[PDB]
Structure 1
């Protein structure tokens, strides 16, 4: 009996991401001679978390705009709408994500009335 096997480090962690693949990648990416035990658990955790944050906002993407499948465009609306992710990915370009609806309030007319506003923003 070569003893009862099982238990993935991802589980002993309660993590949805591959702790062991990650420890593998760290060891093989010439990042450092030796990689610690905690290291991959920590990295996988951070990775799962950020994935979650995007997806989360990426889901509410097809809801405030209808649809049930997450396409690039949602991811983009998600990221560029959240200050923090936007910075983290301020030098990244999501394919087929388009831009955000913005239109300099000096190009669009209205020279009549409506609701003359200039004491808010």
Structure 2
């Protein structure tokens, strides 16, 4: 295979990652294993998020993942939520939550 992603068996563009690292003034030189490692990390995170996003879209009987789904997914998963704890999702909305003392007795 020609593509480095195929060599590493990855869907993301390792070449693009390598360019980015080199065009970002993060260090004088970039190793050859870092683009692969970083691309794998990015792929893994994207897959993890997409799993929950698709599951949420299913729960709402929808063929397309829309921002509401992305929000729901992230905010329901403790770790993902912590990673994006200071991030805002356009059209995200919020998890449905009402404080107990506000419920009638």
How far does residue 53 in structure 1 lie from its aligned partner after superposition?
0.5
Q: Which has the higher contact order (CA 8 A, sep 6+)?
A: 2
- Deviations along 1:7-44, whole A, 9 cap, x unmatched? 11000010000001001000010000000000000000
Write out the 4+ residue segments of structure 1 that deviate beyond 4 Å after TM superposition.
Answer: none
The number of aligned residues is 105
How far does residue 61 in structure 1 lie from its aligned partner after superposition?
1.0
Tell whether 2:41 aligns with 1:46. yes
Q: Which residue of 1 aligns with 2:67?
A: 72
- SS at 1:11's partner residue? helix
Q: Which TM-score applies when normalising by structure 2? A: 0.97
Give structure 2 stretches of 5+ with no counterpart: none
Q: Which residue of 2 aligns with 1:62?
A: 57
More helix per residue: 1 or 2?
2
Tell whether 2:21 aligns with 1:8. no
Q: Which TM-score applies when normalising by structure 1? A: 0.84
- Deviations along 1:45-102, whole A, 9 cap, x unmatched? 0000000001010000111121010100000000000000000000000000100100
Aligned-residue CA RMSD in angstroms? 1.9
